[PDB]
């Protein structure tokens, strides 16, 4: 009857603290326990790999979060570096309570974990996106720990050329967490995309890299952009929407380009092979930097006929538009290419990845969809129709029809009601009209006769902001109220950050304070115990409106209309002493580049936060072990323990 | 006669033979300004022939490029009295004067600004203001080629190679303007340092004097005076040296030789120098610098024969040549040809380069050519050998304070 | 017949030349104590500068600021774009373009400053007369045969009339590549250190008849780590005896194919080690005389008529000297 | 006034081409094409170009069919300002589908040359662009020497670094220059070429566009600035341009004529004094 619970992330990262959750159950009120938890050897040999940390838990305090440290010296000495086959390790909890109470053969309870040397966040940016051969290349890397604080650990950068051969390598100490460096591209180097990689010296797998392009080019004077009238082409048999483009050419310093535009059309497939339309080439004189050309109906039909292609065959193809504008009388040539144009059967796209699977019977099913305009920003105010067909629970199936428009940014939350003893649920989601986007998903049901169920209801479907408190409702379903409390934890960046206990009540609430470090996605895992069988449910919550912990603001005094050689009073504003890194880039580099490389912004940093997340889907599971595995934890209660994850990817 | 409307704005002018045909008009402007045109010809009674006249301001060269750094303020050509500041990016330690002020002679002050990280085997030679450099690799055995810009003339080394000892071969090039000259105060320490390297054994010194028609009788008198103080000072150091006096013209004349033993006596050399006159060079008034250098080479070969091929007594013999000319070699061929013979016979290499220094002191303000003086003078790192002085007063001034 | 203005122009000395054209600047890293003002000096390039920004602080983590677009515009300039490739002794046609964005007709005399190493048209002293209508642009064609064989500074200058005091001057250093085209001589040698015969190998020295003097001889070694080579390349050289040792495997395997610049004149030797199937590719580059108007396309413009020159470009006798 | 252009186009490779091609000819410095001629050109059924656009010194033509043979078409332009300097223009022909498959052609003025004339020999060569040699005639015209005009030209400006009296063996034309192979009668002066001697060959070259004539079998006095061409044989080879003094030598009879005694005698007096004594400065 008494039990000891062991909670820990499925993957342990070397050199950074590990959070271990420990818990009791059904223990006498006056009873207390003693013990220590430590990482043991992968059992190929037997040497402890971490210092022992004590825990003192009782009836009134039956939970505690232990910050178990895993120093690199102990990991190297005990034999993790000498391991064979895969990278596993064992975490066990040692306490005489097991033998004293449960009369177990051993006083050791543990889990199987994967150990990876990846740690810290490494960011690095180069001088320019594109360079000429024989041109000096400058770059710098930033070293940051788990909490993105500046890190002083030594790092080993390297440079790989276009062919992939290493060209440079520097093992550099970190006094200021920034390492500036420069090198010269060989004058005989062929065009290609070079790569600069940076790793922590003791972290083998912590390689963060950036890429820059090398090409024989000269700086352009103006850039040409081709913007389609609509980023989609409707190819439904009933009608085909007109194809129209607005070709613009403007001098980079602002003024429009005067010249002519040479437009060549063609069909481009997914592989990349482009078949040009012989004929229909349009040449126009740019009037106010712009030329508005369009493809007619009969012209396009004849073009398809010449290639012996049908409208119904245009599935997945792309209408390829290329331009080569000649400045007049300047004579300069600049080329623009269009490849985003896609033949589609519906002007909308449905993303159902947010829809939780394996949902509990007896509680509302939260269908969540993202109505994103095809190759565009999320759409707002677009109706969504879903037909829910509850499969036979013993009677005839029933069809439930709910309609709800998109509140904003494509977010639609449709709480369909699921009856008890449901065999399986079939959903058919349709959004937009006419020519809707059809998305179909089917979900099974948990096995009948289970020990119970837990439901997590989130009244506010809008994503929480930074610093905004989030409250969830927990309700046990399908079992008696033998238990007195349930327990919940919050997972961010693959580490257990919070643990608490809430007493069982009626229509209960659990409040979670969304800290900044919990962004951009944290897992909420809650579970209770019906006798000796665990039942759990994990809800994934994403955090939007990501912003820096501090702030950095650049501003230029006055209007942005200067003259060459004049003075600029650039303004920097922040809230603390910061190693501000600056860089002024000529805009023409973006135009000359074959592929436009977006600069470093908060999106990449927040993705770097999410790169350490161990989550597997939007949460939920048939059993407690499945819920914990999807969340990214390892659970062992002495009788049932989840196996170590087969792969980090969790396909 | 020629028309009288030959006035220059802000300056004066002088005439050689009045307004008669064939007379040469000389234009002069105060310091900080350069005459333009420099001189006019009265023609065969026609309108004045030029190779409105205005004293255009002096303007120092502006940095064409500044590798791994910025320079403020940025101008096309800095005027007189202007300033330029040279600070460069992080990881690079500046060398030379960060602040350089354009002097009225058309030259900056202080060493040329350059910052080097030190990764290269040799120190960064840098881009001297007004010049450009080709080749950004400082590896051992690598080379850099310099080219002037606009209408500047290159004085110094047009090609430098990073030698094994970590010093670039040749001197640091300095793009110069045709109208630019040298102040005595600037050039006295350079001559002192070069002669200090020379005195660091027995030394052979040859003094070459100009006695053509272009140089005047008074000008040659000041040349003789400066030579006399020069030989007076070197004998005051109690160092074994032999000095020879050569005064060249269309045909060179030898007033003293190193073969004679009298060259090691102060009274003898001064008596030989004072006996010089203009009458002997009056019959032929050319400027055959090649012939003078060939006479020097003949002295070299005679000393060779009398001393010996491999005798130590000659191996420790160092040679320093001084030329007080107006830089108008117009017969006998290129004077550089005889310098090639001298370098060949002396077996000049990277090690024996200490044994040969050639000083080419130009004098005058009208017909002095920078290319000729630069070509004659020797080129060594950190030292200047080719000089131009506007007046022989400046020549006497620089010599009388030349040593310390 | 056409009216020409002479010497009533701008003095050409007041016109401010533009010479700083950096692709990127402001690469410094600054310590901001919650407030700092930087006095940046804008470069002479006429584009828009997107000034990036990243913050790294010990207490507030990391932030990336929004880039600031900064625009520089002159309203009348001589934009000049040098050709990508300029070989010595090869005729190229410089194309300075005068963009006149004002509201008045402008007459400008365009000329290239005569410099040593450039053979211009008529010695480089003549100034070409062009007129740029308001709100338009005109190109001026300068044909140059560079004989410098080294980098040289040109300064194209545009001089308007004294009635309308405008003008621009641009001074970019024009790197002159050396005579001929580049040739590549790669040499492939499979590297099996297990076989004792492959322990020591020597690459033959280069004796190429068509190699041009001052052939910028650069050697790069491309050695592949695919299977632990300790290839030590030893070589006598005119510059000196230099040997740099390559350890490709580093007791590790993540795309460790290596490339290192190798500085040799003629001779080269190999000392192998380890156990692997690596490949050595010493790459030699040098100038060569070779040729290729397209073989596919061709074009010919023939002109007949009377063209009036400006009495300063007529190459003939003055008839009175 | 009005100048008739003619732009010609054809293709030979036949492989890798896409047919339609873009013509981009740049007119002379002070010329803009007539729009009337071009619109008449494009209004014809077999116009050979589907589109055109010209502004100032630029003309754009879209050739939608480039065949094997030489088909081409011409238009007429007008002059705005006189051409400031004699110089060829550039015309470029682009490929519609692969613009990187291009190649420009240099076309000269109606009578001038295609490329800048440069006296190129050995591995270094000189800028041959400049002015015509004058071929000064004072004794032949009978004009007496004034203020030593030959001596003034030799010593004052442009100072001469080489001076010889040469007998012209032959007249030949190579590339853009007319080569006069000459034999050295005497060496008056020399800065470079220390190996000058009597009875030696020297190549004197002048641009073919000029009318300068050096009759073979006659002697002339040539003075001027050096060249850096080296003749590919070893001896420096001189070019004739501005700053070069060329005078026809006194013969048995033209110096006999009455007004010419003083002139020919004075020129020979210059000969002996300058060769023997020097510049005297
Ligand atoms: C680290 O290196 C591995 C092996 O080359 C690569 O697959 C992985 O993408 C890298 N990780 C990064 C770039 O985050
Ligand atoms: C400029 O030239 C145009 C074209 O010849 C003419 O119509 C106009 O009046 C002129 N002046 C202005 C101020 O635009
Ligand atoms: C390569 O050199 C290292 C230098 O430490 C040496 O220890 C090693 O044995 C060599 N490589 C192999 C594969 O033996
Ligand atoms: Mg003289």
Curated annotation (Swiss-Prot), chain B:
Disulfide bridge map: 2-42, 29-55, 60-102, 88-115, 122-162, 148-175
Presence of keyword Secreted: yes
Gene for this chain: C2
Location of this chain's protein in the cell: Secreted; Cell surface
GO terms, molecular function: metal ion binding; serine-type endopeptidase activity
Enzyme nomenclature, EC number: 3.4.21.43
Uppermost EC category: hydrolase
Family: Belongs to the peptidase S1 family.
Binding site for Mn(2+): 212, 214, 287
Miscellaneous: C2 is a major histocompatibility complex class-III protein.
Key words of the record: Age-related macular degeneration, Complement pathway, Disease variant, Disulfide bond, Glycoprotein, Hydrolase, Immunity, Innate immunity, Metal-binding, Protease, Repeat, Secreted, Serine protease, Signal, Sushi
Glycosylation sites: 7, 83, 240, 283
Disease with which this protein is associated in UniProt: Macular degeneration, age-related, 14: A form of age-related macular degeneration, a multifactorial eye disease and the most common cause of irreversible vision loss in the developed world. In most patients, the disease is manifest as ophthalmoscopically visible yellowish accumulations of protein and lipid that lie beneath the retinal pigment epithelium and within an elastin-containing structure known as Bruch membrane. Complement component 2 deficiency: A rare defect of the complement classical pathway associated with the development of autoimmune disorders, mainly systemic lupus erythematosus. Skin and joint manifestations are common and renal disease is relatively rare. Patients with complement component 2 deficiency are also reported to have recurrent invasive infections.
Lineage, highest ranks first: Eukaryota, Metazoa, Chordata, Craniata, Vertebrata
Residues the entry annotates as binding Mg(2+): 212, 214, 287
Protein name: Complement C2
Coiled coil: none
Domain text: The MIDAS-like motif in the VWFA domain binds divalent metal cations.
Cofactor(s) listed: Mg(2+); Mn(2+)
Recorded consequence of changing residue 298 to A: Promotes partial resistance to degradation, slightly increasing half-life of the protein
GO cellular component: extracellular exosome; extracellular region; extracellular space
Swiss-Prot record, chain C:
Positions of modified residues (Sulfotyrosine): 317, 320
Record: glycosylation sites: 105, 230
Protein name, entry field: Complement C4b-A
Function description: Non-enzymatic component of C3 and C5 convertases. Generated following cleavage by complement proteases (C1S, MASP2 or GZMK, depending on the complement pathway), it covalently attaches to the surface of pathogens, where it acts as an opsonin that marks the surface of antigens for removal. It then recruits the serine protease complement C2b to form the C3 and C5 convertases, which cleave and activate C3 and C5, respectively, the next components of the complement pathways.
Cell location: Secreted; Cell surface
Record organism: Homo sapiens
Activity regulation statement: Specifically inhibited by nanobody hC4Nb8, inhibiting the classical complement pathway. Specifically inhibited by NbB5, NbE11 and NbH9 nanobodies, and to a lesser extent by NbH11 and NbE3 nanobodies.
Quaternary structure and partners: Complement C4b is composed of complement C4b-A, complement C4 beta and complement C4 gamma chains that are associated via disulfide bonds. Non-enzymatic component of the C3 convertase, also named C4bC2b, composed of the serine protease complement C2b (C2), as well as complement C4b. Non-enzymatic component of the C5 convertase, also named C4bC2bC3b, composed of the serine protease complement C2b (C2), complement C3b, as well as complement C4b.
Lineage, highest ranks first: Eukaryota, Metazoa, Chordata, Craniata, Vertebrata
Segment of the intact protein contained: 758 to 1421 of 1744
PTM section of the record: Upon activation, the internal thioester bond reacts with carbohydrate antigens on the target surface to form amide or ester bonds, leading to covalent association with the surface of pathogens.
Chain positions found as Phosphoserine: 161
